[PDB]
């Protein structure tokens, strides 16, 4: 049994607009990571406007065989307080298609951990 | 100095129809190949109708510095003669965006060599 699964989204970066463009966008897949499978599942690169689509397949086994995907997001938007340009990890909800994830805007100058702590 | 590509199509398998579904569809450059760097631009899984779209970016160095992009194909089609399932290798065109490839129906029952032989 595999499932399947689509992102999509418009990447952002208020900091430095040019940064949306030519982004490199992995779905992995956290339980083929563990275990020790190739976890990645999609990976695209946005567009000039920041638009991305990336869809992917998994098939795990084992203990752990429900595929829980995320994204992965390398980037060189400068971040509003730091100029970070750090990875960013999106949880991506366990939802496979038919449904589609639409992410909406995707910021890359804010981080999860701002606002958590 | 990074170029990026689309491809697009629709997989066909005359000989096993539900054989276009979820299949694995890598988008590599083999320029990067030939310099030992990560050669993956992009990787999608087609949907339940056997389309797919995949879209990456390569930024190449050294004297082969012209991103050079295929399509792998790694699937379950039979072919219709012998019943293999061999990986499909497709040429892609060094045609970059805001230039799209739309490839249309590709079939998986049948191979290059067929033919040129």
Redesign the interface.
């Known amino acids: 049994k595999?499932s399947?699964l689509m992102a999509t989204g418009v990447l952002k970066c208020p900091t430095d607009p040019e940064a949306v463009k030519?982004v490199?966008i992995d779905l992995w897949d956290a339980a083929a990571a563990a275990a020790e499978s190739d976890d990645?599942?999609?990976?695209?690169?946005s567009?000039?406007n920041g638009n991305?689509?990336?869809?992917?397949?998994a098939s795990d086994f084992g203990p752990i065989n429900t595929p829980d995907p995320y994204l992965y997001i390398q980037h060189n938007c400068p971040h509003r307080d730091s100029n970070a340009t750090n990875p960013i990890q999106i949880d991506v909800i366990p939802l496979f298609?038919?449904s589609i994830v639409r992410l909406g805007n995707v910021y890359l100058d804010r981080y999860l951990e701002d606002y958590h702590h």
């Open positions: 595999t399947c030519k490199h990645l599942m999609g990976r695209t690169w567009d000039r991305f689509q990336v869809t992917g397949c298609l038919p």
